[PDB]
């Protein structure tokens, strides 16, 4: 496919810088791992350098690199066609019965590696709700995303749902509703996608020997040509 | 396995009884076809008896039988487990920047035929919007549903998105946000579900010899064990 896709052969380091503010509580996070797009794998470790995180780690997972997705020859790959100059990624995330997050990322290739530099602002949460009351499990369900093209901006649009399990229930979930849009940083030719889906499977872990608040993960991510494979 | 499921071998006939009211306009639709649950397929033809539908046909498809889905041995099949007595299925459907549908349906097994009898009420639409203005294509995309358990009430919960393409844009979509709850009608024992997904692929047609406002469809539907398949 694209000449940007040349940069993703083999395993490549991944570096994350996040700044956050949820109803007055501020915090910074740093992450380090790798991605291998030939199989759609991402493996990474995260630490909060400022103190404790003010919300459950699972609500931050979607904001903490769709360029590592396994894309076959039959679909256009927007994310890698933008590389190395990169893309801006923006979301609004709205919690069932509670507040919302707004996010803005720059995702680029620099110095042999992928950088995700992202800012998060949270507003309108209940002080006794599941979020600010830290009442959600340290785990994660499999998801399916919807993706299509915006020919007017030579970009990408996406809409999906994410489920979070309630601490002290078993099989009761709230929903975080996701809307998203992506725009190129450079002015050069890119690949604008057509309608398709993307599967995610995430597993979370921790390390008790590190005294800082922490989280690790492993994920598998594939593009799905659903106009053909759901027949 | 469950006693309901044996009612489903081979082609089983399907009847639909639907009434609507969207801001001033009452209307009725009657449908007939069959479903074959061993391959997950459904065929059916629809007529509007009162005149022309006052919203585009695409917006009505999800309201117009999840008992015809292909379930393999590895997952609990709630819909089939309820039969022959049936279940109640209620939804709220909220359209991006416009109004909403509330629907209440009863789904039963009677004389070797499945019956879907359903009521729909619509409120808060704009006269110049894509819905009341009728400005959406006569076509459909593949979708993916999330399904889980509500043990407390021996019931089922579901949440998901549906895309509708805007006429005269090309490639741009509006989203219809769906929430759903199902409750057994009878008293027998049933299979409460666990977290899984369900795939859909739908194709619309017309019978152009016929003078009444009309629509046909064919569909493939299957349950998905995502905790293993997404790995």
């Amino acid at each position: 496919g694209s000449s940007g896709a040349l940069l993703f052969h083999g395993k490549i380091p991944y570096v994350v810088e996040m700044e956050g503010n949820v109803d007055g509580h501020t915090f910074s996070i740093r992450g380090k791992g790798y991605g291998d797009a030939s199989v759609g794998k991402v493996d990474a470790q995260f630490i909060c350098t400022t103190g404790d995180v003010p919300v459950p780690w699972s609500t931050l997972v979607t904001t903490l690199a769709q360029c590592f997705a396994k894309y076959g020859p039959e679909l256009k790959d927007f994310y890698k066609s933008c590389m190395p100059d990169g893309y801006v990624q923006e979301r609004t995330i709205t919690f069932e019965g509670d507040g919302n997050f707004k996010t803005r990322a720059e995702v680029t290739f620099e110095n042999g590696s992928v950088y995700n530099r992202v800012k998060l602002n949270g507003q309108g949460f209940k002080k006794d709700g599941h979020v600010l009351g830290k009442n959600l499990e340290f785990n994660f369900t499999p998801h399916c995303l919807y993706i299509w093209g915006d020919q007017a901006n030579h970009g990408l649009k996406s809409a999906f749902k994410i489920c979070h399990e309630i601490t002290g229930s078993k099989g009761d979930f709230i929903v975080a509703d996701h809307t998203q849009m992506n725009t190129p940083i450079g002015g050069g030719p890119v690949h604008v996608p057509e309608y398709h889906h993307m599967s995610y499977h995430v597993k979370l872990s921790k390390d008790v020997t590190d005294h800082r608040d922490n989280m690790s993960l492993k994920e598998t991510v594939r593009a799905v040509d659903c106009r053909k494979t759901y027949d």
Side-chain angles (χ1 to χ4, degrees), chain A residues 11 22 30 33 36 39-40 54 72-73 83 89 105 113 121 127 133 142 163 169 182 190 208 213 217-218:
Chain A
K11 301 156 193 209
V22 180
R30 303 289 178 260
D36 185 349
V39 287
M83 298 289 185
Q89 177 162 299
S113 320
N121 285 83
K127 330 59 69 226
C163 299
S169 88
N182 294 39
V190 295
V208 277
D213 202 1
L217 58 82
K218 290 197 200 281

Side-chain angles (χ1 to χ4, degrees), chain A residues 1 9 11 16 28 31 68 74-76 83 93 106-107 115 117 126-127 133 159 165 169 183 187 189 199 217-219:
Chain A
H9 302 163
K11 301 156 193 209
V16 182
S28 315
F68 290 123
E74 75 290 3
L75 290 166
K76 270 114 99 139
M83 298 289 185
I93 297 157
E106 292 171 33
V107 179
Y115 277 81
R117 303 185 167 96
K126 290 151 177 61
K127 330 59 69 226
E165 186 174 26
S169 88
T183 309
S199 68
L217 58 82
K218 290 197 200 281
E219 65 195 38

Side-chain angles (χ1 to χ4, degrees), chain A residues 39-52:
Chain A
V39 287
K41 177 57 73 70
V42 174
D43 182 309
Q45 282 108 83
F46 299 87
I47 52 162
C48 178
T49 62
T50 46
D52 274 8

Side-chain angles (χ1 to χ4, degrees), chain A residues 79-90:
Chain A
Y79 311 103
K80 297 181 194 62
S81 73
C82 291
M83 298 289 185
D85 286 337
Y87 52 87
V88 171
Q89 177 162 299
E90 298 164 286

Side-chain angles (χ1 to χ4, degrees), chain A residues 10-210:
Chain A
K11 301 156 193 209
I12 293 309
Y14 179 44
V15 183
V16 182
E17 293 166 19
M18 180 224 264
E19 306 304 334
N21 180 330
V22 180
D23 284 321
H25 297 106
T26 52
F27 61 105
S28 315
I29 299 173
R30 303 289 178 260
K32 190 58 172 299
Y34 73 85
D36 185 349
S38 75
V39 287
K41 177 57 73 70
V42 174
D43 182 309
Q45 282 108 83
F46 299 87
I47 52 162
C48 178
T49 62
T50 46
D52 274 8
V53 298
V55 298
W57 277 99
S58 79
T59 67
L60 306 172
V61 175
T62 60
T63 306
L64 298 168
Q66 299 191 291
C67 54
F68 290 123
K70 199 205 177 198
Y71 264 88
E74 75 290 3
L75 290 166
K76 270 114 99 139
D77 186 342
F78 167 86
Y79 311 103
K80 297 181 194 62
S81 73
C82 291
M83 298 289 185
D85 286 337
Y87 52 87
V88 171
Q89 177 162 299
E90 298 164 286
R91 302 201 175 111
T92 300
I93 297 157
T94 68
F95 295 86
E96 206 193 314
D98 229 328
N100 67 98
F101 295 157
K102 287 180 211 297
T103 72
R104 180 180 190 279
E106 292 171 33
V107 179
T108 50
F109 185 101
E110 308 170 29
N111 296 340
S113 320
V114 178
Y115 277 81
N116 175 21
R117 303 185 167 96
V118 64
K119 173 78 183 299
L120 185 142
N121 285 83
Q123 311 64 55
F125 286 94
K126 290 151 177 61
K127 330 59 69 226
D128 47 320
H130 300 307
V131 178
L132 282 189
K134 291 175 186 185
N135 194 50
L136 298 173
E137 304 285 30
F138 194 73
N139 63 18
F140 226 75
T141 49
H143 302 114
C144 182
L145 285 31
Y146 292 177
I147 297 157
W148 67 97
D150 183 339
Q151 198 65 237
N153 287 306
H154 292 99
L156 175 152
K157 290 175 98 192
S158 184
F160 54 101
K161 281 177 194 296
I162 296 287
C163 299
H164 296 299
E165 186 174 26
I166 302 161
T167 301
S169 88
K170 309 89 197 193
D172 298 332
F173 303 97
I174 70 168
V175 178
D177 197 72
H178 281 60
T179 62
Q180 189 187 318
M181 83 168 265
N182 294 39
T183 309
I185 300 174
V190 295
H191 292 175
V192 180
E194 282 249 291
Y195 185 96
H196 62 283
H197 294 169
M198 173 174 300
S199 68
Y200 266 81
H201 197 286
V202 170
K203 165 72 150 184
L204 322 176
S205 69
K206 280 182 290 87
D207 188 343
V208 277
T209 81
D210 192 329

